[PDB]
Design a protein around this motif. Structure first.
Motif, PDB file in Angstrom:
ATOM      1  N   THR A  43      -5.448  19.551 -11.778  1.00  0.00           N
ATOM      2  CA  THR A  43      -6.765  18.579 -11.427  1.00  0.00           C
ATOM      3  C   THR A  43      -6.933  17.737 -12.291  1.00  0.00           C
ATOM      4  O   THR A  43      -6.947  18.022 -13.770  1.00  0.00           O
ATOM      5  N   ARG A  44      -7.661  16.370 -12.225  1.00  0.00           N
ATOM      6  CA  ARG A  44      -8.068  15.455 -13.319  1.00  0.00           C
ATOM      7  C   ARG A  44      -9.698  15.639 -13.273  1.00  0.00           C
ATOM      8  O   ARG A  44      -9.959  14.476 -13.876  1.00  0.00           O
ATOM      9  N   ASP A  45     -10.510  16.331 -12.685  1.00  0.00           N
ATOM     10  CA  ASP A  45     -11.657  16.277 -12.815  1.00  0.00           C
ATOM     11  C   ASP A  45     -12.410  16.931 -14.059  1.00  0.00           C
ATOM     12  O   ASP A  45     -11.771  17.251 -14.597  1.00  0.00           O
ATOM     13  N   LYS A  96     -15.360  23.685  -4.711  1.00  0.00           N
ATOM     14  CA  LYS A  96     -13.991  23.603  -5.129  1.00  0.00           C
ATOM     15  C   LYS A  96     -12.997  22.477  -5.546  1.00  0.00           C
ATOM     16  O   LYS A  96     -13.664  21.508  -5.512  1.00  0.00           O
ATOM     17  N   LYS A  97     -11.753  22.904  -5.910  1.00  0.00           N
ATOM     18  CA  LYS A  97     -10.958  21.854  -6.040  1.00  0.00           C
ATOM     19  C   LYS A  97     -10.762  20.629  -4.841  1.00  0.00           C
ATOM     20  O   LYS A  97     -10.688  21.123  -3.754  1.00  0.00           O
ATOM     21  N   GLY A 101      -3.829  15.938  -9.454  1.00  0.00           N
ATOM     22  CA  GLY A 101      -2.736  15.447 -10.509  1.00  0.00           C
ATOM     23  C   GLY A 101      -1.317  15.758 -10.104  1.00  0.00           C
ATOM     24  O   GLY A 101      -1.383  16.831  -9.150  1.00  0.00           O
ATOM     25  N   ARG A 102      -0.177  15.472 -10.597  1.00  0.00           N
ATOM     26  CA  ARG A 102       1.152  15.818 -10.209  1.00  0.00           C
ATOM     27  C   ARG A 102       1.881  16.287 -11.462  1.00  0.00           C
ATOM     28  O   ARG A 102       1.428  15.758 -12.567  1.00  0.00           O
ATOM     29  N   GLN A 103       2.810  17.011 -11.324  1.00  0.00           N
ATOM     30  CA  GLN A 103       3.719  17.661 -12.230  1.00  0.00           C
ATOM     31  C   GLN A 103       4.337  16.249 -12.890  1.00  0.00           C
ATOM     32  O   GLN A 103       5.040  15.498 -12.301  1.00  0.00           O
TER      33      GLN A 103
END
Lengths: 78, 192, 176
Positions: free
Chosen positions: B3-5, B22-23, B29-31
């Motif tokens: 996550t990018r929050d 929640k998320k 975000g990605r790997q």
RNA sequence: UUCUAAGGAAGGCAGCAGGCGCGUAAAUUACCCACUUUCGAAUUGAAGAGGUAGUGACGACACAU
RNA sequence: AAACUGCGGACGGCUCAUUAUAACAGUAAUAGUUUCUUUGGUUACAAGGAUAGCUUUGUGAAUGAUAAAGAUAAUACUUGAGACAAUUCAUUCAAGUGAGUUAGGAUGCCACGACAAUUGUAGACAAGUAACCAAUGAGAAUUUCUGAUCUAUCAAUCAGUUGGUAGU
RNA sequence: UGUAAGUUAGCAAGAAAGAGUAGCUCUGGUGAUUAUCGAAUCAGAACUUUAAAGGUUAGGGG
């Protein structure tokens, strides 16, 4: 000469080569880029003549100045 | 997933940030994909709004631009010699933006031969300027005015020229770079 | 009896759970199933479910094995149903060339009740509307060719009718 | 929590009705898309959104003796 | 009728557990992002396979359970003429705007690549489609300034924590 | 990394409790002389296996 103190090479956002006296591009130098911000603010002499590199400077980069404008007094410079 | 929050961080005062939700997918975000050097291998990623990102898992070739001569030539990538962020990226040959790499200057030398009639890979290159379809002599006098940096010539003769990757292989799926020149080549050569 | 050669192509467990071709065990396993291999039929689009299936190796627990055919296997035969509808399919099964008509050979079936020789609707023949489909739909690029396209340069000429005229440092160009 | 042939299987009423429990304390297991409007391949089909009716001395207004 | 395909079930409906600068209200920015739908525009006399409803054989006690074979369509899945568009990178000439190496043009290069190989005989004219601009969009999402109840028998708190460079 | 009651405020305390440690191939920090020379020490990363203080020496704790 003195601004290349990091691991990577420091360049401006808009780095362009200046023309030679014969009228064609000279790839041996880079034009020092500087712009003018908006609502009645003068560009300091250091932004024009200085050799520093900054990608967040409002005078030598592509960061714009938007609506909100405030004033204050410096608290810390660390 | 990642996550990018900023709700999982702390405030500028150091105080912990509590939880209200929640998320969510907006801050997804990605790997990362570490684009290595090898056989070509790319994948298609469905991003938000259906757009497609080309995830380059492995690449070998790339298009590199010689700024002075105003040409762009496809070229095989040999090695990664200097990464300004992590020294681990040098050993693993990870292709990322700003990674100084080495490529074989075969098409550039071949282009120079056809376009000019001389060869950079010649150790007597500057001597070959003094000593001379037949109108190539008109072009011959351009070099008695403009000069190349020495480190570029050594790379031409040794078969490994230095170039800087200027694209995002994990986003566009390709390596777009440019051959280093006067002030940049000296800086990056002293690092090595 | 004499016996032929057969290849196992399906089957169901004692409890009705089918067998998956890929699964290479004997007992029952649970897989995250989508409709690609078949053993699960999704309701929503892109919905998977963890279902139980049987392995590809035959064992004693199998109750039915598909390895009851077209009219009574033993020694028998009868067929037909649902002839072709695409015109290009009509030609191939009846030794028909490209130019000769096919409607004299299109499959027809009778109707008998309290009449009618029905036939499919031929697709992709060289029939009147279908021949002229170009002139009806596929031609008439007027939307892009004659009305559009040239309008670019037809209306590009405006770059000189009053565009450069205004560029001469005058006030305003009249329409005429 | 439920079905089961005992081998196995699905389900999430803080949706509309309704039941248990809890508490001093809170209503029908109704009818219809006719109003407002949403969805759909579309002038038509659905909608416990919505409307109508039922219980209702929480309340508000007029009015008998 | 059923079935494939398309669209929708991300709206509406319920509740207030979590939440103390978090959310929310007014305000301001997006020159730091942006779909869907709808609306303006811009760019071969026709090809290839197989799949459901259908038929046939079935299993399990059973689910909105399911297995084999035989065919058959496309605005489903593909190829293919009809001739640009938008992506990355390098270099360069630069006019609205408070303000942009900015919308834009030029050069060289890579990937992508079309305007259904489409439908109404009736209600020539519809209808449909792929990308690319603009509007919808004072929308959505992030972000700027100011504003929250009690408590000091809570006085020090923080280590991705605060900033920089390069990347992801 | 973490560490209590108690206290003469010095201690308790190595409290208690938890994690890491091998081999190989590398990377970086700490200087001298003016490019050459030198020291064992610390930190980090891939890979491999029989998953690593334990041959010997080597606190049981509350």
């Amino acid at each position: 000469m003195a601004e290349q103190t990091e691991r990577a090479y420091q360049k401006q956002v808009f780095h362009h080569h200046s023309r030679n006296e014969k009228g064609e591009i000279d790839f041996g130098n880079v034009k020092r880029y500087h712009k003018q911000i908006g609502m009645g603010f003068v560009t300091p002499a250091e932004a024009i003549k200085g050799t520093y590199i900054d990608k967040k400077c409002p005078f030598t980069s592509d960061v714009s100045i938007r609506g909100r404008t405030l004033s204050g007094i410096v608290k810390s410079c660390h | 997933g990642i996550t990018r929050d900023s709700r999982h961080k702390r405030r500028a005062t150091g105080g912990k940030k509590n939880s209200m939700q929640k998320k969510k997918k907006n801050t997804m975000g990605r790997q990362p994909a570490n684009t290595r050097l090898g056989a070509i291998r790319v994948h298609d990623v469905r991003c938000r709004y259906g757009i497609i990102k080309r995830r380059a898992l492995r690449l070998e070739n790339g298009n590199f631009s010689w700024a002075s001569q105003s040409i762009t030539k496809g070229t095989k990538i040999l090695n990664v010699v200097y990464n300004a962020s992590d020294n681990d990226f040098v050993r693993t040959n990870t292709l990322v933006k700003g990674a100084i790499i080495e490529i074989d200057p075969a098409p550039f030398r071949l282009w120079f031969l056809k376009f000019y009639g001389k060869d950079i890979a010649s150790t007597d290159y500057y001597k070959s300027l003094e000593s001379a379809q037949k109108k190539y002599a008109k072009k011959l006098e351009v070099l008695k005015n403009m000069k190349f940096d020495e480190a570029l010539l050594e790379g031409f003769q040794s078969g490994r020229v230095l170039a800087c990757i200027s694209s995002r292989p994990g986003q566009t799926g390709s390596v777009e770079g440019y051959i280093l020149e006067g002030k940049e080549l000296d800086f990056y050569s002293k690092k090595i | 009896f004499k016996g032929y050669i057969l290849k196992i192509t399906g089957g169901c467990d004692k409890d009705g759970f089918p067998m998956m071709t890929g699964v290479a065990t004997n007992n029952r396993v649970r897989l995250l199933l989508d409709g690609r291999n078949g053993c699960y039929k999704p309701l929503r689009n892109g919905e998977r479910r963890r279902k139980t299936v049987r392995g590809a190796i035959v064992a004693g627990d199998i109750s039915v094995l598909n390895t009851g055919e077209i009219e009574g296997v033993t020694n028998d035969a009868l067929p037909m149903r649902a002839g072709p509808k695409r015109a290009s399919h009509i030609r191939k099964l009846f030794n028909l060339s490209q130019k000769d008509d096919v409607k004299k050979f299109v499959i027809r079936r009778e109707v008998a009740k309290k009449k009618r020789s029905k036939a499919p609707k031929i697709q992709r023949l060289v029939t009147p509307r279908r021949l002229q489909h170009k002139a009806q739909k596929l031609e008439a690029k007027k939307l892009h060719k004659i009305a559009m396209l040239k309008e670019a340069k037809r209306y590009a000429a405006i770059l000189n009718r009053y565009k450069v005229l205004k560029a001469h440092g005058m006030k305003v160009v009249s329409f005429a």
